[PDB]
Amino acid sequence: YKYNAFTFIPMNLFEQFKRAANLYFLALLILQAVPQISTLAWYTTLVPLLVVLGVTAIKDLVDDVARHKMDKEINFKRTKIDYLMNYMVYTIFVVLILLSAGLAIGHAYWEAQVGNSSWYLYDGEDDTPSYRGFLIFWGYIIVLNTMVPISLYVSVEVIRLGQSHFINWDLQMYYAEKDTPAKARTTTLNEQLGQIHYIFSDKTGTLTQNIDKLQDGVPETISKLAKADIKIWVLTGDKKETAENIGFACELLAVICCRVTPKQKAMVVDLVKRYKKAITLAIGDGANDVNMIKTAHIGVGISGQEGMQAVMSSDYSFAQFRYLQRLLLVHGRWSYIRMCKFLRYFFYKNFAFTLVHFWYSFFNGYSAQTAYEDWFITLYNVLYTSLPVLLMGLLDQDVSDKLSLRFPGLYIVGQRDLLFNYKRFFVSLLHGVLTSMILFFIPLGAYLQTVGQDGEAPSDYQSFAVTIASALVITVNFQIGLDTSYWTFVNAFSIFGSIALYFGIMFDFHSAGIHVLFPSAFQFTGTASNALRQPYIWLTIILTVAVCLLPVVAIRFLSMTIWPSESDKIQKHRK
Amino acid sequence: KTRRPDNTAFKQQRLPAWQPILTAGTVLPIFFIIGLIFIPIGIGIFVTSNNIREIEIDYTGTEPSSPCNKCLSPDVTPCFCTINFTLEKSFEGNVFMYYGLSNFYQNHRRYVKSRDDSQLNGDSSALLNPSKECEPYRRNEDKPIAPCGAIANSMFNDTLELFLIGNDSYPIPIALKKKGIAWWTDKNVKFRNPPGGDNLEERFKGTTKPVNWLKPVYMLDSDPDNNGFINEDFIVWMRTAALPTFRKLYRLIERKSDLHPTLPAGRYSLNVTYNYPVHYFDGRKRMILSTISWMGGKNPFLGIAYIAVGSISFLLGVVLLVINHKYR
Ligand SMILES: *[C@@H]1O[C@H](CO)[C@@H](O[C@@H]2O[C@H](CO)[C@@H](O[C@@H]3O[C@H](CO)[C@@H](O)[C@H](O)[C@@H]3O)[C@H](O)[C@H]2NC(C)=O)[C@H](O)[C@H]1NC(C)=O
Numbered sequence: 001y002k003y004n005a006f007t008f009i010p011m012n013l014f015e016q017f018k019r020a021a022n023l024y025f026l027a028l029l030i031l032q033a034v035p036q037i038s039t040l041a042w043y044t045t046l047v048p049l050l051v052v053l054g055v056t057a058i059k060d061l062v063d064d065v066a067r068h069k070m071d072k073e074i075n076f077k078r079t080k081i082d083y084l085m086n087y088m089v090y091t092i093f094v095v096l097i098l099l100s101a102g103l104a105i106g107h108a109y110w111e112a113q114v115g116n117s118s119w120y121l122y123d124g125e126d127d128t129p130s131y132r133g134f135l136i137f138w139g140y141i142i143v144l145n146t147m148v149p150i151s152l153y154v155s156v157e158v159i160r161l162g163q164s165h166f167i168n169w170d171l172q173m174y175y176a177e178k179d180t181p182a183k184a185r186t187t188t189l190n191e192q193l194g195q196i197h198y199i200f201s202d203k204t205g206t207l208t209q210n211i212d213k214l215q216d217g218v219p220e221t222i223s224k225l226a227k228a229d230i231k232i233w234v235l236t237g238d239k240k241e242t243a244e245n246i247g248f249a250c251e252l253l254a255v256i257c258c259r260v261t262p263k264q265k266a267m268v269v270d271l272v273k274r275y276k277k278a279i280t281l282a283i284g285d286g287a288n289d290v291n292m293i294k295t296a297h298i299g300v301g302i303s304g305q306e307g308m309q310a311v312m313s314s315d316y317s318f319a320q321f322r323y324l325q326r327l328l329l330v331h332g333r334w335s336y337i338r339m340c341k342f343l344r345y346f347f348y349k350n351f352a353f354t355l356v357h358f359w360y361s362f363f364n365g366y367s368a369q370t371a372y373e374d375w376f377i378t379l380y381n382v383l384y385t386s387l388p389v390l391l392m393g394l395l396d397q398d399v400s401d402k403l404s405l406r407f408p409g410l411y412i413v414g415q416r417d418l419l420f421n422y423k424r425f426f427v428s429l430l431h432g433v434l435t436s437m438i439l440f441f442i443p444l445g446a447y448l449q450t451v452g453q454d455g456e457a458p459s460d461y462q463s464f465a466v467t468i469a470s471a472l473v474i475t476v477n478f479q480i481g482l483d484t485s486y487w488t489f490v491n492a493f494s495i496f497g498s499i500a501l502y503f504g505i506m507f508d509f510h511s512a513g514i515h516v517l518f519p520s521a522f523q524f525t526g527t528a529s530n531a532l533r534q535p536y537i538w539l540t541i542i543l544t545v546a547v548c549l550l551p552v553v554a555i556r557f558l559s560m561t562i563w564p565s566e567s568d569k570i571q572k573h574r575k
Numbered sequence: 576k577t578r579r580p581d582n583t584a585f586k587q588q589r590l591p592a593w594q595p596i597l598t599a600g601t602v603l604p605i606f607f608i609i610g611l612i613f614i615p616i617g618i619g620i621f622v623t624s625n626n627i628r629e630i631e632i633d634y635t636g637t638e639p640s641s642p643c644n645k646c647l648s649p650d651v652t653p654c655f656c657t658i659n660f661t662l663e664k665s666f667e668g669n670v671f672m673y674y675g676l677s678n679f680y681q682n683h684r685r686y687v688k689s690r691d692d693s694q695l696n697g698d699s700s701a702l703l704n705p706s707k708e709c710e711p712y713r714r715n716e717d718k719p720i721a722p723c724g725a726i727a728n729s730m731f732n733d734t735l736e737l738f739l740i741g742n743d744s745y746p747i748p749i750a751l752k753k754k755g756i757a758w759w760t761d762k763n764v765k766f767r768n769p770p771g772g773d774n775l776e777e778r779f780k781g782t783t784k785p786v787n788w789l790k791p792v793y794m795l796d797s798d799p800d801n802n803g804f805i806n807e808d809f810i811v812w813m814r815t816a817a818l819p820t821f822r823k824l825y826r827l828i829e830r831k832s833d834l835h836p837t838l839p840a841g842r843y844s845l846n847v848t849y850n851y852p853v854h855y856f857d858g859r860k861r862m863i864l865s866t867i868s869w870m871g872g873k874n875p876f877l878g879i880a881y882i883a884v885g886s887i888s889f890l891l892g893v894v895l896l897v898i899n900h901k902y903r
């Protein structure tokens with residue numbers, strides 16, 4: 001019951017120090033605060049940071065308000081993806097550090113060869129080529145900072161929070177006469193529902209009504225998950241007597257170790273976890289089950305008749321065991337696909353965005369200049385490429401809910417963990433490298449030659465920057481459009497809204513009206529109105545967008561044609 | 576616990592939606608349509624680009640036997656070349672003359688940041704208080720340099736003159752107007768002189784010329800509409816190039832009153848006042864003449880690129896049928 005109305009100081013402390021990326025961006029503020037190495041403005045990090053920090057604060061302020069009112073009237077689990085996400089952020093640091101030093105070495109020699117004799121690159125600081133190369137190491141840390149995704153975290157709670165609510169609202173996972181819907185009481189364990197390997201179930205209170213007779217739909221729910229290749233263990237009952245009598249039932253129900261006291265219940269859970277390194281979901285009711293609920297990666301608590309006491313000590317608390325089908329096959333399965341598709345696109349669209357600086361490093365003396373508007377870095381992560389991936393993370397459906405139940409075999413995609421590996425992180429990294437290379441060199445070739453050259457000639461850096469950004473925004477927003485399978489009217493709105501919102505914002509940012517307000521902060525006045533009215537620039541953007549999307553379309557088409565996925569095989573057959 | 580969940584399309588994940596599946600009949604057509612549309616676009620750009628007549632004269636003179644090599648060691652400050660070139664085919668329509676600089680990293684980070692935007696906008700406060708970004712050229716001796724920044728200081732300052740050598744052999748200078756060679760917005764929005772006053776002499780108090788500039792920013796052009804911070808050459812120069820090898824609009828050539836072409840085929844001599852030294856860092860200097868086309872300028876890269884992408888589109892399109900046909 002914290003947040004005593006004067007306690008905003010520890011929330012950022014919980015946000016900043018605990019999270020590896022958060023304090024890095026904080027350490028990044030100090031890096032770019034000193035003008036001696038500041039290659040980007042402080043706006044570039046604060047605005048995404050405050051939005052990312054602010055949204056997370058809102059998502060947690062509401063939670064404590066509920067606790068206060070709850071306590072006013074009366075008077076740790078971590079996902080497999082969370083660890084993978086954590087490591088990849090560090091992996092970006094070393095790559096960011098390596099490139100910054102690498103380009104620093106290239107810059108150090110460039111100053112002794114070209115920079116020294118280049119009289120136009122004289123600044124009065126008698127800096128030896130070793131010292132200039134050292135200083136720019138921090139400059140290339142700042143420019144390539146957005147290689148570390150700033151909205152990676154906040155987006156994850158939004159996807160998980162939204163996915164958890166679909167469990168609450170599911171009319172199919174709702175009990176009529178008891179009037180007890182499903183409830184996801186932890187909103188941070190979602191993709192793991194799609195990665196479940198083991199199920200631990202109590203019998204008295206979960207597989208039965210406790211009023212005992214088996215619970216309706218259990219024989220077909222138990223079989224469905226088995227077809228999804230989830231092993232089911234029951235830790236309950238009284239010796240082989242009750243075991244085989246009901247074990248042989250439920251369509252053969254597998255280890256049936258019975259008689260387990262709650263001490264044995266939690267002990268048995270750890271045996272599979274430590275000696276198999278697999279994700280487990282525990283389902284039960286009553287005090288005797290709360291032991292496994294905590295130890296297991298996912299805890300499920302049936303309302304049952306034993307007592308409304310094991311539900312609040314769990315992660316999901318729907319009313320019937322039969323509702324376990326939709327929790328995993330529908331809600332869990334879609335959550336993993338939605339999450340992995342999000343991360344696969346999230347790292348790509350940042351690498352494809354930042355690495356243009358690296359390619360443009362070779363044509364500016366390795367001097368660490370931005371290839372974009374400084375204000376394009378600010379809004380790229382929160383505004384231009386935030387909603388469409390978020391909507392996909394919530395609304396995407398490879399197959400319908402009814403078809404997902406009829407095909408439990410689509411679940412293995414999560415158990416095997418195929419849609420986001422440590423390898424596929426680099427493929428999205430390579431895909432960012434190539435897209436950035438295409439997003440840079442195709443405009444480069446056009447800009448090397450004549451590009452709409454007349455009294456109004458976009459042959460400059462700013463038009464070069466706008467062209468690369470414009471092709472980038474369309475490419476990534478078309479890339480996410482290629483990723484989505486469930487084109488809801490809101491999914492289409494977000495994709496075109498992001499592109500329209502981008503194109504709308506440049507005009508306001510590039511209009512003469514905003515120039516007078518802040519002439520130094522917003523300096524591309526007239527660039528969009530001049531660069532985007534030229535057919536050669538649009539031919540460049542169309543060519544750039546095409547040559548960076550058709551290979552994706554061709555590769556995507558070949559991959560499903562040569563190695564069709566389980567989803568594609570059944571998605572092709574509508575019936 | 577609580578009442579039944581609200582029954583809505585969104586809450587139940589039953590929204591009406593379209594499920595596009597990349598069947599062999601939906602992605603193949605866009606490949607040929609892309610290939611069928613790109614090739615004519617590539618052909619149109621390529622033939623149009625080749626129909627543009629361009630001539631470039633590289634006049635820096637680093638190599639021996641170039642007849643102004645003395646300008647690399649100008650014991651006397653004013654150095655002049657004289658390069659003769661011949662036009663095989665006449666130039667039709669508006670003709671633009673440029674200057675090119677190679678191995679000139681105008682996009683260097685220390686270089687690009689070195690400019691005071693508020694000052695360039697005609698700000699009284701930033702006029703006498705240059706931004707610390709243009710630190711090396713904030714002030715020279717006692718007062719701030721009005722066009723601060725490395726870029727403004729290191730302004731291309733040659734003077735390329737084009738002459739027509741007729742049968743009589745007497746040179747005939749051709750018309751050359753420097754006005755209207757910059758973006759409309761830049762002249763009227765982004766770049767402005769200090770406000771107030773009518774004469775530009777009285778509008779720059781307590782500010783010296785940049786060290787590299789021979790003379791201050793008062794009399795860049797006799798035309799009052801093209802002098803000062805809004806000078807067309809200055810704006811064109813300050814408009815940072817994207818790449819080290821770049822070319823910038825320098826002069827215009829308008830349609831001649833007579834029916835004859837703007838630049839009839841013949842002998843032309845380029846008399847250039849060599850003032851810009853770029854040979855220390857292996858810099859090249861060029862003068863480029865080009866004619867307007869109804870579809871942009873001379874971009875063989877875009878023309879060739881569209882031919883290629885339009886072509887590999889067929890190659891991808893045609894090949895993808897083989898995979899489709901085999902695995903039907
Ligand atoms: C055309 O531009 C060039 C530069 O691209 C000018 O050469 C530069 O001239 C300045 C003088 O205004 C030189 O600065 C200093 O000059 C003093 C003598 O006054 C000298 O003692 C210093 O050592 C220093 O050189 C500057 O160094 C020089 N640039 C280079 C690369 O040496 C040229 O004057 C311009 N000409 C016209 C007609 O605008």
Ligand SMILES: *[C@@H]1O[C@H](CO)[C@@H](O)[C@H](O)[C@H]1NC(C)=O
Nearest residue numbers: 642657658659660740744844
């Ligand atoms: C260039 O032309 C001028 C005048 O026509 C002439 O005096 C000079 O000798 C010519 N030089 C060369 C190298 O043709």
Ligand SMILES: *[C@@H]1O[C@H](CO)[C@@H](O)[C@H](O)[C@H]1NC(C)=O
Nearest residue numbers: 655656657734736846847848
């Ligand atoms: C070339 O231009 C200069 C500068 O106006 C002039 O003095 C000279 O007579 C011209 N002709 C030459 C150098 O043959």
Ligand code: ALF
Nearest residue numbers: 202204236237288
């Ligand atoms: F029979 Al139980 F938890 F209800 F083991």
Ligand SMILES: [Mg+2]
Nearest residue numbers: 204205285286
């Ligand atoms: Mg029980």
